[PDB]
Design a protein around this ligand. Sequence first.
Ligand SMILES: N[C@H](CCC[C@H](N)C(=O)O)C(=O)O
Ligand SMILES: [Ca+2]
Ligand SMILES: [Ca+2]
Ligand SMILES: [Ca+2]
Length: 417
Amino acid sequence: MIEKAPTNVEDRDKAPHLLLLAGIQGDEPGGFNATNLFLMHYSVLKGLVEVVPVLNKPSMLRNHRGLYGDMNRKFAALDKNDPEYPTIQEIKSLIAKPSIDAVLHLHDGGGYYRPVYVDAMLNPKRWGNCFIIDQDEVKGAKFPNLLAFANNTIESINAHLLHPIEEYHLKNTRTAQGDTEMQKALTFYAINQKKSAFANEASKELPLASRVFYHLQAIEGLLNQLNIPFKRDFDLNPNSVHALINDKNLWAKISSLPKMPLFNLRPKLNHFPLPHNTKIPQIPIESNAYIVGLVKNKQEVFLKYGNKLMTRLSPFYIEFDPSLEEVKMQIDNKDQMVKIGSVVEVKESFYIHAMDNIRANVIGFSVSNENKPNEAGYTIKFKDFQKRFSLDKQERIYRIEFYKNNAFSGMILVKFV
Ligand SMILES: N[C@H](CCC[C@H](N)C(=O)O)C(=O)O
Ligand SMILES: [Ca+2]
Ligand SMILES: [Ca+2]
Ligand SMILES: [Ca+2]
């Protein structure tokens, strides 16, 4: 769970609290791209929005609806030895917190819901582009009138339709009255804890940016009904959502390696250092986004951003010796200390000063066929690189890797600028 909170802690109790959740199915990227953009680009000014951006992260990383089955059918009876039992208990504990008032659960679904059968694409069994409640009232909730909240949220969404077919409709599943499937799902659990709970389903027939657009409209609609004041730092239209999903300023940092751009990496990165004796899901990974991770695929390690494959690492596993903190380098004539794990911009040249116990391999530069070269003490320019070794499709970013005997001492990136 990630909090979207006011800057002043005193403002937290001055408006309601929403729990916002997505990615219970790992192949529903509208939901988890919307929670990601909410976390990256919105501000909550009073009250609180608690976000679980992706509920089923292992499944997200495999672009899969659910590696362990349907996680959204595990909120009623569940065996203690279900692989997702611990995750389910964390989510139930979040939902049932006294400080939570409302829950909003995001999904992507095929076709377009209609309250009467129109055809195979548009009918009551479809889930696309609807706003869903389990029943019209939850007595004892802070906001008992789920129907009124839903209808007003639907008004807000329908004021911004991209095409008339995308019109939102209310879907009340009347779950207590015999819907056996919905009785095992998240929002019914939430109403049984006297929370006002809602689900938003964006149509899978839409492109991703348009799915995310509708999810964000639903979030904003509901926040308005709850009177949780918020801002965002962009204009809510599909172009503008697309730009933020595909933002060139997005980065990932694996272990103690430097930050790397998410987008426009080469599709494969070779001889990529990773810490040995560490399971892939335990390798630290940091990002300015909230849906990034690593997953093993045969002997490669995939860098994922939601369902997007950003690169395939061909790793070699090695001890990460953390002793080396900085390196003396000359950058464009200017001698300086550069921290291990840095990215340095280079206009013209660089030069690595020799070190007693450290060997430097500039990846893409060579002066011989030596397998473990030391390339400190060379003045290096763009023209000296074999471009195929660049990190990036643009051929501007190169790795410098440092070694102390058979251990890895760190990496610095140079970016030619
Ligand atoms: N298409 C979704 C709708 C679930 C809606 C609501 N009951 C929730 O738990 O969010 C499903 O079949 O799981
Ligand atoms: Ca922003
Ligand atoms: Ca779903
Ligand atoms: Ca080299």
